[PDB]
Write a protein that binds this ligand. Structure first.
Ligand SMILES: [Cl-]
Lengths: 319, 315
């Protein structure tokens, strides 16, 4: 009932065995080595798409690089997913999450725009949420160069990218884009860059994760909050879009995704809360290393598909 | 959903046109006319079933009347739904909720056992939850009197019957029955009868509902609380079965269902929280008077089906 999946144990062993630069092996985590290691073992290939296209989105600090993923070359008007990557083991960009965004596009049969928002410390807050909001409003306008007619937005993101989902949804709630946000899907969201990581002894499942693995997740959280800066949404959640919130059972910050789901329910916002029992923080980009993550991701995508179908059915009824 | 649905506004005008609450209560003849009115306008007919069978369940206060609904005359082994009715606009029995339990059995394609648990003031607390637990344990043993073998339980109930779902799921969590409870579906649960009904002032949608309508829901809630009694589930919710929790947008006690869904999420229990925007307390037996309630119920049934499918994949 308290457990670690066997593929999860293997990944945690792989993390503990990662040597350092020939400079000094010891306890070694050069971002360069992490980048090589995670690119190699983490996720499946991007694979085949009808559309895989670089975009340039006009933004308040210059052009925002983005990328369109679509199983189809062309399609009827419908929703578009806008994706905000999180970070941790790697800083994160279009390449780190590209296999996930391609697979999301295939399973939901919808176009996915992934956003390469400005990172800290090069670009202070509020560059990251400004870019995410600019990108959502641009997609919502159905720009000629996108080659898609967009009738609604779905926002998706992982870890601190999850908080970029929450803050962008709240911004478009307060000042709507051309079309509405009809669903949010934050994966294991990190909802407060101000909040200190739990210590080993404060996590009830610490004994299952082990101190050495928990140190990895702590380091990832700290690095992520350094690079991906957004404000906690501590105010009223009334009028936020219907949600799928997914946590990791072995994630020391599972309480952050749980509390967001709980606050949505208390405000009367529909929410599907799921927890990946015996899986870790960061699983959506670990679908090769930890194949049991596929089931976790597919369960989230099925819930999101139900919200989208119901949301479009309720709009066809109202009109 | 547009603050008050047109069909809901029509039902509230219908309610205002009946003889209504006096000194914050429904007296005996007012309630009597309301019950005939609700029987005449509320729900569609029971309709066609492959099985519609009366049952007698042994319980700690005598026999417990129950009724099996099933579209199929005969079926492979599978989950069984146990249903614990609520009340308020109806007294609550096998007849008042029969159309709902029949439609639940058809849509899910599963047997539903509705339970006629002992009521107060004749049988005081804890007869109701005792009967509900006994009935669930009985169904779990796959008794010969059902023509059906049971691999798992699903618990479902409305209003004070929603709290019988919660208390019963907790009892079977602590001391398992022969098969597990794989899902819970409380509709607009009343989770703490000892709490005061919200005032017109305290309910944020009071102005949409109107004072006269609010007095009706308050009187109907008091009438239900007299008949159907269980105490709040007090401890840790960890280990509780995966849930679909449905509230009413115009229901003064929506905070109770919202808070239950929120407490499940905090404990790491998977939960689908849904709120029927612009619909009222008691909609699951108002599918004829308020046809828009069909969409609310089918949405809850679709989410419940996803839980059952995932529960049986995993096993
Ligand atoms: Cl922000």
């Amino acid at each position: 009932e308290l457990f670690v999946r066997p593929d999860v144990r293997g990944f945690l062993d792989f993390l503990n065995n990662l040597p350092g630069p020939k400079m000094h092996e010891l306890d070694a985590p050069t971002a360069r080595q992490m980048y090589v290691a995670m690119k190699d073992v983490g996720d499946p290939p991007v694979g085949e798409l009808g559309t895989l296209l670089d975009l340039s989105i006009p933004g308040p600090g210059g052009d925002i690089p983005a990328r369109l993923y679509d199983p189809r070359a062309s399609r009827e008007p419908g929703p578009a997913i806008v994706f905000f990557h999180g970070g941790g083991f790697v800083i994160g960009d279009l390449e780190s999450h590209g296999s996930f965004t391609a697979e999301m596009a295939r399973v939901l049969d919808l176009p996915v725009i992934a956003v390469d928002y400005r990172l800290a410390p090069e670009f202070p807050w509020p560059a990251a949420p400004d870019d995410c909001e600019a990108a959502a409003r641009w997609v919502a306008n159905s720009p000629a160069e996108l080659g898609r007619s967009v009738t609604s937005l779905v926002l998706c993101g992982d870890s601190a990218g999850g908080n970029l989902v929450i803050v962008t949804a709240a911004a478009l709630r307060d000042q709507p884009a051309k079309v509405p946000v009809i669903a949010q899907l934050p994966f294991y969201p990190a909802t407060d860059a101000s909040k200190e990581y739990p210590s080993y002894a404060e996590f009830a499942e610490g004994y299952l994760l082990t101190r050495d693995s928990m140190e990895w997740f702590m380091a990832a959280y700290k690095s992520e909050a350094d690079h991906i800066r957004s404000s906690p949404l501590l105010g009223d959640l009334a009028g936020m879009p219907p949600a799928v919130v997914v946590t990791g059972g072995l994630d020391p910050i599972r309480d952050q995704g749980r509390a967001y789901a709980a606050a949505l329910a208390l405000a009367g916002v529909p929410v599907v809360f799921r927890e990946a029992k015996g899986n870790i923080h960061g699983f959506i980009t670990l679908r090769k290393a930890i194949p049991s993550s596929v089931g976790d991701v597919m369960g989230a995508f099925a819930a999101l598909k139900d919200i989208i179908v119901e949301a479009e059915g309720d709009r066809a009824m109202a009109q």
